[PDB]
Amino acid sequence: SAMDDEYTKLLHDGIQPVAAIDSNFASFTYTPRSLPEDDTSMAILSMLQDMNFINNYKIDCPTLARFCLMVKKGYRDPPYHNWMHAFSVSHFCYLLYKNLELTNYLEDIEIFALFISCMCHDLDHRGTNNSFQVASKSVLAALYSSEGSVMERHHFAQAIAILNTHGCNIFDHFSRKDYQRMLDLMRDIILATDLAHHLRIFKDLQKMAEVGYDRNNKQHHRLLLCLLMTSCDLSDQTKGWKTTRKIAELIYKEFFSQGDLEKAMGNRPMEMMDREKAYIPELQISFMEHIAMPIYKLLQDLFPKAAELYERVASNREHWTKVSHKFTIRGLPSNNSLDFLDE
């Protein structure tokens, strides 16, 4: 029984210090996906220890170890939306705490909720978007389509189910008020990961950055939590070209699988999910320019030490422009054949 021994070690051996994981672990240059998957549960505990959440909130270590394993095991294995995505999004949250002094802008309990929301925010993803849920009349649409953010509601609900599994409630000693505040935060933060939501609140984020962040304004807290969540969710784009290239591979595999299922059902997939129509370079450029860059630009406006993130993201965009031409076949293909043209 793989999990029982894994739990034993994670509990009885002790929490390893962050620096023993990698000398560079707490820097924006680090690529969390470099960490072997078998070490990631220990890494989560190490990050929580280093942020001092274990002691500040008196988390029971047996309960925590079970919780982390249950969360990990609650991800499936589609090419992009898997445990390694949630681990890396969680790691970026840790980066922001380390590098940007969040405690000057947010309450402790808010930062904690953000991190625990990053762990849980794609739980049980099936490699399909919200609209596929509605078009295929899945069980999840039956439960949630009338409210919208179908997958995100499912993710949150899976988080709650893990919490109400016996031995997994890391918050069960909180006051009733703090318990309710944590669950409410997790709902808002995980819901914020639907990009439709982000697009709706984009102007309100702009406004906040114009007038300047007001720590006494409760709506500013909520808006910032959303922006930070989105920043963690897309943080793959703040690393190096190699990571970006690889990540695009995983996303388009996942997207194109969806499109293949849609074609089988008689539907026309959106362009970016149709392997016969998607022109990856112009799609990435558009995504980078019209969604990702403005996010990290806002983050830079609010936190001057976040400049390097924006610049990476702009640099990754230009790189796509630069390699775009390689998607045109010049000469013959490697095999020296034009057989591919009767296909």
Ligand X SMILES: Cc1cc([C@@H]2CN(C(=O)c3ccc(F)c(Br)c3)CC(F)(F)C2)n2ncnc2n1
Binding site for ligand X (CB under 6 A): 195, 234, 236-237, 247-248, 251, 272, 283-284, 286-287, 291
Number of H helices, E strands in the chain: 16, 0
Select from 162-170, 190-198, 253-261, 263-271 the region that touches Mg ion (CB under 5 A).
Answer: 190-198
Is 221 annotated in a binding site? The answer is: no
Interaction of residue 110 with Mg ion, rule CB under 5 A: no
Contacts of 270 (CB under 8 A, 6+ apart): 131, 259
Q: Do residues 40 and 16 lie in contact, with contact meaning Cβ atoms separated by under 8 Å?
A: no
Number of residues that bind Mg ion (CB under 5 A): 2
For residue 26, give both structure tokens: 């707490």
* Closest CA relative to residue 232, chosen from 78, 88, 73: 88
* Residue 251 binds: one of ligand X, Mg ion, Zn ion, none (C-beta under 5 to 8 A by kind): ligand X
Q: How far is the CB of 193 from Zn ion (least distance, A)?
A: 6
User: Looking at beta carbons only, is 42 or 190 nearer to ligand X?
Assistant: 190
> Rounded CA gap, 220 and 225, in Å?
9
Longest pairwise C-alpha distance within the chain: 70
Residues in the chain followed by a break, C to N above 2.5 angstroms: none
Contact of residue 262 among Zn ion, Mg ion, ligand X, none (CB under 5-8 Å per partner type): none
Residue number with CB closer to ligand X (191 or 247): 247
Euclidean distance between CA atoms 76 and 79, whole angstroms = 9
CB-based contacts of 18, cutoff 8 Å, min separation 6: 25, 26, 46, 47, 49, 50
Cα–Cα distance for residue pair 180/2, rounded to 1 Å: 34
Using CB under 5 A as the binding rule, whether residue 122 contacts Mg ion is answered as yes
Helix, strand, or coil here: 214? coil
* Residue 276: CB minimum distance to Zn ion, A: 27
* Beta carbon nearer to ligand X, 151 or 185: 151
Residue 95 CA to residue 47 CA, distance in Å, equals: 10
Backbone angles phi, psi at 278, to 5 degrees: -65, 125
Q: How far is the CB of 93 from ligand X (least distance, A)?
A: 15
Q: Which does 234 bind (CB under 5 to 8 A by kind): Mg ion, Zn ion, ligand X, none?
A: ligand X
Out of Mg ion, ligand X, Zn ion, none, what residue 131 binds, judged by CB under 5 to 8 A for its kind, is: none
* Closer CB to Mg ion, 258 or 300, in the complex: 258
Work out how close the CB of 121 gets to Zn ion at its nearest, in angstroms, rounded to a whole number.
6
Closer residue to Zn ion (CB): 223 or 251: 251
In this structure, what DSSP letter does residue 139 have? Answer: H
User: Residue 179 CB, nearest distance to Zn ion (Å)?
Assistant: 25
Residue 85 assigned ligand-binding role: yes
Q: Could you tell which of ligand X, Zn ion, Mg ion, none binds residue 301, using a CB distance below 5 to 8 A set by kind?
A: none
Whole-number Å distance between alpha carbons of 31 and 281? 23
Determine if 152 is a binding residue for Zn ion (CB under 5 A).
no
Q: By CB under 5 A, is residue 233 in contact with Zn ion? A: yes
Two structure tokens written together for 82: 């898997």
Which residues from 302-321 bind Mg ion, rule CB under 5 A? none
Q: Alpha-carbon distance 237 to 198, whole Å?
A: 17
Catalytically annotated residues:
81
Q: Kindly tell me which of 21 and 234 has the beta carbon lying closer to ligand X.
A: 234
Give the binding range for Mg ion (CB under 5 A) out of 40-48, 66-74, 182-190, 193-201: 193-201
Alpha helices per DSSP H over the chain: 2-12, 40-50, 53-56, 61-73, 83-100, 108-120, 130-135, 139-144, 150-163, 176-191, 195-211, 218-233, 241-264, 280-287, 293-302, 307-323
124 is in an annotated binding site: no
Site for Zn ion in 118-147 (CB under 5 A): 122
Residue 274 marked as a ligand binder: no
Binding residues for Mg(2+), as ranges, are: 122
Binding residues, as ranges, are: 85, 121-122, 233
The footprint of Zn ion (CB under 5 A) covers 122, 233
